[PDB]
Design a protein around this ligand. Structure first.
Ligand SMILES: CCCCCCCCCCCCCCCCCC(=O)OC[C@H](COP(=O)([O-])OCC(O)COP(=O)([O-])OC[C@@H](COC(=O)CCCCCCCCCCCCCCCCC)OC(=O)CCCCCCCCCCCCCCCCC)OC(=O)CCCCCCCCCCCCCCCCC
Ligand SMILES: Cc1cc2nc3c(=O)[nH]c(=O)nc-3n(C[C@H](O)[C@H](O)[C@H](O)COP(=O)(O)O)c2cc1C
Ligand code: SF4
Lengths: 55, 226
């Protein structure tokens, strides 16, 4: 992303595609390494009534 | 196999004491009172919130309103002050004021009211009564008086007393009402004697007749503690 515009233009000419829109090197746009604590949902049988195992 | 392994008949004081009167006075005389297959006289113990709590011998199929208004002078504050009646002692489920107007105090007409006759002990509970505190005290009676022999009573009656002690405060969510109902159905009929049945029945009666009062109890707990 720090490639100068002469090398950036030569590189786009040599590939034939627009390369800065689709860079295979990852930058600030990817997810944060430290994520907030989650709250996972419980299944359908987490009930206190009408929840017999035989049914 | 009864007492000492002998043949035995265990019989109530009332059904023993009335039998020489049946043999002297006659069988048709004792059969003339009350309805058919509900024959005879019966002792009734009207206690709770009445003006004159009293024991009285009365004919078998007497209406409940006539009994309470005549022999006990009516409910404290009149009949409009009535909230609920446990009809025959603690083992039977209670009936609300909407059922006590036309109900008859024998076996079969109370079985039609999805309760029982039992001991014919009319406990009257007026509008001034926290009914949830009374039924949780009743389940406290059934866990302090339970011999601990088999599993469902020994575990579930203490567990129903804990759930009812939270229902008094309202420290639950409403999905624990129906849960508690299932606990009663896991006790009623799966025990040795009918104290598991006699402890499952009042929980079922309280839920069936005052579910919205428990729900508004728990929701006002949930808003006043959060
Ligand atoms: C062929 C002729 C020389 C080309 C010079 C060159 O490659 O310039 C890079 C320069 C920018 O290249 P880029 O691919 O965009 O990389 C950006 C850097 O990452 C952005 O720069 P940077 O942030 O990486 O800066 C650090 C870098 C900065 O880079 C330099 O200083 C390059 C020096 C090259 C000489 O310096 C170093 O890494 C220290 C020097 C290590 C390389 C030494 C090479 C010696 C070669 C001769 C012996 O290229 C141009 O401007 C186009 C070519 C110019 C040709 C001129 C006509 C001849
Ligand atoms: C937990 C429990 C307690 C009982 N307590 C008495 C009691 O104190 N007095 C009584 O006459 N029957 C009591 N019974 C009912 C008896 O099981 C039985 O029905 C009765 O003593 C004798 O039957 P009878 O109605 O022909 O006299 C109790 C039943 C249970 C399940
Ligand atoms: S269920 Fe009956 S036999 Fe068992 S502990 Fe309770 S009262 Fe006793």
């Amino acid at each position: 992303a720090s490639a100068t515009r002469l090398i950036q233009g030569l590189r786009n000419w040599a590939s034939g595609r627009d390369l800065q829109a689709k860079l295979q090197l990852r930058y600030q746009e990817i997810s944060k390494r430290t994520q907030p604590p989650p709250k996972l949902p419980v299944g359908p049988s987490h009930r206190l009534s009408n929840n017999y195992y035989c049914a | 196999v009864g007492v000492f392994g002998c043949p035995t008949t265990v019989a109530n004081v009332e059904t023993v004491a009335v039998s020489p009167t049946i043999c002297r006075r006659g069988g048709a005389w004792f059969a003339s009172f009350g309805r058919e297959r509900n024959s005879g006289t019966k002792l009734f113990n009207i206690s709770g919130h009445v003006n004159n709590p009293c024991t009285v011998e009365e004919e078998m199929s007497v209406p409940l309103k006539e009994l309470i208004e005549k022999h006990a002078g009516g409910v404290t504050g009149g009949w409009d002050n009535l909230l609920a009646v446990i009809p025959g002692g603690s083992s039977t489920p209670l009936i609300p004021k909407s059922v006590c107007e036309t109900v008859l105090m024998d076996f079969d007409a109370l079985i039609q009211a999805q309760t029982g006759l039992g001991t014919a002990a009319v406990i009257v509970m007026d509008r001034s009564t926290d009914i949830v505190k009374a039924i949780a005290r009743l389940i406290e009676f059934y866990k302090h008086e339970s011999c601990g022999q088999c599993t469902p009573c020994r575990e579930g009656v203490d567990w129903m007393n804990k759930v009812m002690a939270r229902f008094v405060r309202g420290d639950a969510r409403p999905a624990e009402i129906d849960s508690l109902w299932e606990i009663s159905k896991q006790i009623e009929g799966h025990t040795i004697c009918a104290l598991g049945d006699g402890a499952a029945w009042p929980v079922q009666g309280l839920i069936r007749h005052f579910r919205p009062e428990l729900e508004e109890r728990m929701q006002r707990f949930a808003q006043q503690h959060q």
